[PDB]
Amino acid sequence: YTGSAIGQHWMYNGKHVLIVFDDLSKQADAYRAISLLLRRPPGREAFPG
Amino acid sequence: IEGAIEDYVSSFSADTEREEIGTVIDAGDGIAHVEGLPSVMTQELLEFPGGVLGVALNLDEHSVGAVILGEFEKIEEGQQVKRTGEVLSVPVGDAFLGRVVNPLGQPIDGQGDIAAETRRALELQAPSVVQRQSVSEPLQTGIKAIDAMTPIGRGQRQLIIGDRKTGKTAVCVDTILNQREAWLTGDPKQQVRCVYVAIGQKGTTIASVKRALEEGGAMEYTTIVAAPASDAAGFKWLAPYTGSAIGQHWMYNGKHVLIVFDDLSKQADAYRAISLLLRRPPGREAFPGDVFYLHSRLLERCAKLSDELGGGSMTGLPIIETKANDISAFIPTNVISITDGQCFLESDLFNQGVRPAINVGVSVSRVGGAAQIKAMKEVAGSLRLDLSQYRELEAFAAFASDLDAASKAQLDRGARLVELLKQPQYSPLAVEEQVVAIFLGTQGHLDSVPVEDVQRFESELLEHVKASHSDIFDGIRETKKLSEEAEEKLVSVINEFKKGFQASDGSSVVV
Amino acid sequence: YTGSAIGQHWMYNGKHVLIVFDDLSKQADAYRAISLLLRRPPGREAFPG
Amino acid sequence: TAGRVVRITGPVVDVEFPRGSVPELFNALHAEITFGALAKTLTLEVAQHLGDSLVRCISMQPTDGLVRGVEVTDTGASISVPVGDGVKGHVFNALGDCLDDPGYGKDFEHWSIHRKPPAFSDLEPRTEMLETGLKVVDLLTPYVRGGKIALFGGAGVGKTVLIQEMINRIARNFGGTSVFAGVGERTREGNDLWVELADANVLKDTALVFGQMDEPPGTRMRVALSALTMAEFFRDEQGQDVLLFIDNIFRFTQAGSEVSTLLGRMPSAVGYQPTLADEMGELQERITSTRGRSITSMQAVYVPADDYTDPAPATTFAHLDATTELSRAVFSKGIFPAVDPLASSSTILDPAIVGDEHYRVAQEVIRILQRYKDLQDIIAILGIDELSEEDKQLVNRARRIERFLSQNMMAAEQFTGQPGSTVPLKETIEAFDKLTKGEFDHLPEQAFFLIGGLDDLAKKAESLGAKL
Amino acid sequence: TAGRVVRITGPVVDVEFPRGSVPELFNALHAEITFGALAKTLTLEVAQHLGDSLVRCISMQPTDGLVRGVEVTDTGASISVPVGDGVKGHVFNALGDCLDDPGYGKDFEHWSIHRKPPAFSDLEPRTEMLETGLKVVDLLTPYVRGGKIALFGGAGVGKTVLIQEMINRIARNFGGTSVFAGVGERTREGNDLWVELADANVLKDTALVFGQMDEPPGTRMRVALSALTMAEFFRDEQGQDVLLFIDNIFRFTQAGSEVSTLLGRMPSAVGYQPTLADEMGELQERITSTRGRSITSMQAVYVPADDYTDPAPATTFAHLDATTELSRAVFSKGIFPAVDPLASSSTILDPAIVGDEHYRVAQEVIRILQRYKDLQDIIAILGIDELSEEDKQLVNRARRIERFLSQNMMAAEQFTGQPGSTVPLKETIEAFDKLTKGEFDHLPEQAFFLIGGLDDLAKKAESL
Amino acid sequence: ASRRRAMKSATDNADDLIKALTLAANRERQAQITQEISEIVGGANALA
Ligand SMILES: Nc1ncnc2c1ncn2[C@@H]1O[C@H](COP(=O)(O)OP(=O)(O)OP(=O)(O)O)[C@@H](O)[C@H]1O
Ligand SMILES: Nc1ncnc2c1ncn2[C@@H]1O[C@H](COP(=O)(O)OP(=O)(O)O)[C@@H](O)[C@H]1O
Ligand SMILES: Nc1ncnc2c1ncn2[C@@H]1O[C@H](COP(=O)(O)OP(=O)(O)O)[C@@H](O)[C@H]1O
Ligand SMILES: [Mg+2]
Ligand SMILES: [Mg+2]
Q1: D261 and A44 in contact by Cβ < 8 A?
Q2: Which of C28, D299, E166, E176 is 20 to 30 A from D332, comparing alpha carbons?
């Protein structure tokens, strides 16, 4: 999201941006960790809804 | 029609009575928790404002968990809930023939009221182990594959299990249609009253099924209990029990009933939804610990009663939809365990032109020959071994030169028989016609016929006999056996017809 | 563990001990049963971590 | 009389009201986010009554910036959307707001998006072919006018290309109204469809309702209901034929399951909500034609992970009249549309409706393809030389048939750079009858790839050095 | 001192008792459903002590129509079934109630269905063979006296006739009795079995205990223990050798799983109850030989998904001593009992248990039959002409052997008027030794159908 | 003769392959049931 916001600032000012996420599976794992630590009810593979 | 409403208003009246009440303490997703009602029974029918109905399933010291049977969006915290002092029950009588009703027995076809002979609770116990007698009367589905390989008797529970679009509803509708001649006979010992329970089907599918039954004149003796996809989980869960209650009212009065459940997997899903919403412990596939009990208590009410109780019977035709032909799934496993036999329908057979797509290799009927007439028993004796040997030998189809005479003959006979068991949709065959066709197949009278012609030949010959030699069918029907003289006459008729017949390729079929 | 303790008493007094556990698969099943009845979250093949 | 926010957890908000002011289920409530960057008005749909005057609601917009204790107002009614001929030619969101012309339609008649389905007595089965011009669809999955059509398939198999193709083929000359519901799909695809409809001049007759995959779960839950409400108005009030395009209906179920555990419901099998079948049944049963009133609906159904046994597509299957099932395996062969002819089905593919010749040719094609599927593994291991002569002939025929079921679609010109084609049904039947008889066995199978009728086949065979 | 219902959730009922009156675990309690349509006396089995004087119980009957606060009476003991010779010839449910004659046996001695296995000292260290008298069973798959036999077979394979045959042999040869336990019994099939046993005139030697398909999981879980308790009384008190039939044991396992799920316990691997091994062991360890008397058990086993590694069959086979598979192929040949000599097996077919002569003869028979089975496909496809001369000789010998494994059974008399035979074990061993050696290959095949020992073989050969 | 021997060998190899694949499939089926139950009960416990 930080990278997306930095790119969006340029995007909304007529620039062309290329953003690479290496890699989103790690972000999903981190978000699952956060949700489980908050005791949010898990779903498939323990991922949040 | 103003007189219609005038009659109700002039007849309408209410009287105050000491009533036990509760209050909705919460509500969500079709469930409502209501405090109070200290004397409410388990499964008691409760009434919420605006004529909304619920069933008390979950009783604890704090509140009552109630499944709302419809219009749940009208439920609101603080609303007054009244108990009825009655468990779920439905009206029953002869007036339900030809009607479409919801799981409460209320007509949904827009044809007016239904005159109920009486009322029957949905949870009345099944006939005991001493109130029954052996299943010994055929229930003719009119489908050659079933009537020959997995015969169904009256009081049996024959599961129809298969993947989607394999012809399960087609088979059940063909059975119901086949009951038409028995109905026209007028004799209650031969008549079969039909109940078709539709669970979780879209309303237009139910309308199509009703249209098909109308075409064949089956709605004169058929009742439809419909719980379409838009219905509450309560109706989907209860519909099989409503149909069973109507069937039981007929069964206990000496009648014979055929009940189709299309399909019990959707009922299991509805019950699982209810149980999960009530926070009951989930097990395998999230089903509650009593889903097997659900289906088993439903299907043990299909029985053949003893003569002390009128000798009536109810035959069950539950339908199960498997996924990827996995019959070891939880609900298929349970229902297979419960029932007396199974008809396995397969997509691969269907796409091969084998219709109905019954896998005769795995399809079984534990009742077996006891549910067949003597003639069918004679002609169908060799079919099992013939087809098993054919499936053994089919790997050698292109190598008939390499096969000894016996094996090549077995392969040809197997192909002929596989073509023989094929049947068009909506075309039930009378038992005598089935006997004659199986006789053709198993007596070597199709050997001289090309494989691709067998079907037509069969059909044409059956039309020939019925037109000119109907005495054979008479004999078979009245005596329920194929006499020696009738067999000789049938052989002569077959040979003369073969003389008259012409193959698609043009070659003669004589000798 | 009872067998191991009986054997260890001898092992620590200079003796040589041979202990046979017939079989540890059934001990693992029993411990899994105990853990599940304690509502301990299961892992692979429903066995406790 | 106003409530206040008690708990905020993602898209689910608990609201406490004074005794006797608790809103009815599915009522629309309003809350204010005043933080400048994200200032907005949240619409919350009452999902549950929790007791003690608390209601659990699903937010239609992201709840970031929401504060505990803020006033919550009850509109006294469900979410309602504008209805009437005015909605044609305009783009809306699930809440009824016009996107191309903000403020438009505020004065129209408004209908609640929650509605009971038609009474069972008003339902009449529909049996009438809807010719499309696609060989495979017309031969093996004939579509029903006024019936329910679905396009099943996993991600990226051609569901949306086929939806756009069917828009081109059906809505381009439709005499009634079209409603397109974009349920939880890409915003780029929505913009492309809007531009394409404007260019084709079909927009004037089409109402677009968009809830994208970036919307919170509530919007993806309710956008289908909004579009369906517009369609229901056109069916029941205007009394004209309606085309309803939904893409993707699975997103409704997915959004429902996204909030199921936050709503307090114990999960069902495969992670879905316990109420999957019931919610799907209500929504789908609203999408029907009634006696004398036609809704030809076409739904794209996403199959999670290509698993056709997944509870969502498996539950959806029961609601359809015709199902074109797209396969990843067919896709990876380059065959387009990637239809699995052995797995698709149509309720009107029987001799009574489509006719003896159509049914015969379809059954023969299916039998040949099934036999080829059976022989695939043998050909892969032991080679084709070990097959019997008739099996070799059948394999050649089946390969030509599977290639010929491929077609160059107009909506695919952006990908193949090749203009599309339209094949009349009679030509399709004749061509596949010739194929099943082996009348084209002398042509290279490459001649059958991505063409139209027999004229295109002759041209391509000439280009490859053959001749029929 | 009576309790009251506090919570009802399907078959699970919570009951509150005063402080000093909390029933012990597994005690039987009686509540009343008074609603006219569904009126009944409800049996609850205490499953857990929840604390605060609350007990969680499993209803043995459907709870439909039950009300909160109704009185619950503690009976002071667990489910107790009637015992004695009087239970022979009658049908009981899992609670001991007589079904063919309600109220019958209510005055008999009653035994709790929860009993321990024989003490470690009381067990017999030596496994003993149960000489049934059937040639195939005695030779190829000998049964262990006090052991467990798995039975596999579809429909129309003589499974019921085999059960009747075993009832006959245990009643006549050993002077014993039989208890049939129908776990998850189909009501139609239970009625069929009752009528058939009455017609065979073997019902007098059998006690039937049915826990039917349409009962809550508790009765299906406890019916096996009830039947086992009747058998245990016959063994320990009457000093008889008992034969206990269980059909289906897998349904006992599945009912245990259902009860465990109903009580909120977390499922173990593949969704079975966490204590699956413990429950199966508690059931099976009670079937054994103690103090010169034995309970032998023949158990129908269902294998889920045909997966023998599935936890249910995996646990059941930890206790099975022999396996008997009934084959459609053998039955179609007219060979009765339709035992599959190749698929069937016994754990005590070892020289250390049955001796070297028996082992050698059985191994030779198995070898010959396996070779014949290998040649079966050639015979079917290319015919017997392509076979070698040694192959033809072996085929003839194997056909005669496989037909001499058939026998005229006691239960088959009512079908074929001829009475049954009881071949001594040594006679069978020597006869099959001679057959394998090739001392009867000249005799016609038909002479080997449904006969006893060598004397009957000679007589039937003379008659041809 | 060598073709007969080779096809016998290939049939036995296919037998072994089918056995191993069926064992693997049964293991996967059991694991899937266990994992589904794990997710269901994990969600249920989280709700409790
Ligand atoms: N004997 C038959 N001959 C030809 N077509 C048949 C036959 N039986 C069924 N069909 C066709 O097969 C298709 C599937 O039939 P049907 O809907 O009865 O099956 P199903 O398994 O109940 O399906 P679903 O999963 O949709 O409920 C329909 O087109 C039906 O017309
Ligand atoms: N008829 C076709 N011809 C060529 N390529 C196609 C065709 N249909 C789909 N594709 C390719 O497959 C992709 C997936 O199609 P689309 O329908 O957008 O995805 P989904 O099936 O997930 O909705 C397209 O973007 C296109 O590149
Ligand atoms: N020894 C035998 N002699 C004559 N008939 C037999 C014999 N064994 C079995 N049968 C026949 O085979 C059928 C087997 O059916 P049943 O006894 O119910 O066993 P299953 O449960 O395996 O079908 C019976 O109907 C019986 O007539
Ligand atoms: Mg159907
Ligand atoms: Mg798409």
Answers
A1: no
A2: D299
Pick from D5, D25, D22: which is nearest to D13 by CA?
D5
Distance of CA B230 to the CA centre of its chain: 22
Q: What's the rounded Cα separation, in Å, for the pair B259 and B240?
A: 9
Query: How far apart, in whole angstroms, are the C-alpha atoms of residue B233 and residue B69?
Result: 7
For residue E379 the two structure tokens come to: 């015979």
Residue B366 annotated among the catalytic residues of the structure? yes
Tell me the technique behind this structure. cryo-EM
Fold of the domain built from segment(s) B376-500: Lysin (1.20.150)
- For CATH 1.20.150.20, the residue range(s) in chain B are 376-500
Cβ pair D267:A43 closer than 8 A: yes
Do B154 and B139 meet the contact criterion of CB atoms below 8 Å apart? yes
SS3 state of residue E167: helix
CA D227, CA D369: separation in Å to the nearest integer? Answer: 39
Whether residue B476 contacts residue B375, with contact meaning beta carbons closer than 8 Å, is answered with: yes
Containing structural domain, residue E216: 80-347
DSSP 3-state assignment of E320? coil
Radius of gyration of chain F measured on its C-alpha atoms: 21
* Cα distance between residue B275 and residue B257, in whole Å: 31
DSSP structure string for chain A? -HHHHHHHHHHTTT-------TTHHHHHHHHHHHHHHTTPPP-GGG---
**Residues, CB-to-ion distance under 5 Å, ligand 5:** D 159-160
The span from the CA of A13 to the CA of A15, in Å, is 6
Is the CATH code 2.40.30.20 the one for domain B1-90?
A: yes
* CA distance linking residue C8 with residue C17, whole number of Å: 8
Can you tell me the distance from the alpha carbon of A4 to that of B90, in angstroms, rounded to the nearest whole number? 62
Single-letter code of the amino acid located at B104? L
Tokens representing B154? 């009256």
CA–CA dist A46, D119 (Å, integer):
42
Q: Closest Cα to residue B314, out of B221, B218, B193?
A: B193
Give me the residues paired with residue E300 across strands: E151
Neighbours of E20 (CB within 10 A): 7
Within this chain, do residues D341 and D449 fall inside the same structural domain, yes or no?
A: no
CA angle E89, E94, E95 (to 5 degrees): 100
Is the Cβ–Cβ distance between E427 and E400 less than 8 Å?
Answer: no
Pairing of strands E71-78, E27-33: antiparallel
List the single best residue of F29, F40, F45 to mutate versus B (max B Cβ within 10 A).
Answer: F40
**How far away is chain E from the Cα of F6, in angstroms, using its nearest Cα?**
17
- Say if residue D42 is in the same domain as residue D92: no
Q: Which residues pair with D211 in a beta bridge?
A: D183
Distance from C-alpha of D77 to C-alpha of D23, rounded to nearest angstrom:
9
**Measuring CA to CA, how many Å separate B15 from each of B18, B152, D351?**
10, 53, 61
Rounded CA gap, D347 and D350, in Å? Answer: 8
Measured at the CA of D314, the angle between CA D308 and CA D320, to 5 degrees, comes to 110
Alpha-carbon dihedral of residues D377, D383, D387, D389, nearest 10 degrees? 130
What is the total count of domains within chain E? 3
D112 touches chain B (CB under 8 A): no
Distance CA B1, CA B118 (A): 28
Helix (H) or strand (E) holding B161: strand B158-162
Residues E194 and E165 reside in one and the same domain: yes
Q: Which residues of E touch F41 (CB under 8 A)?
A: 266-267
Nearest C-alpha neighbor of E155 from the set B150, B328, B387, B302: B150
Resolution (Å) of this entry = 2.6
First to last CA, chain A: 19
Q: Whose CA is nearest to atom 25 of ligand 3?
A: E156
**Contact between chains at A41 and D259 (C-beta distance less than 8 A):** no
- E263 is written with which tokens? 């009580």
CA-CA-CA-CA dihedral for E111, E116, E120, E121, to nearest 10: -20
- According to DSSP, the β-strands at E91-93 and E206-212 are parallel
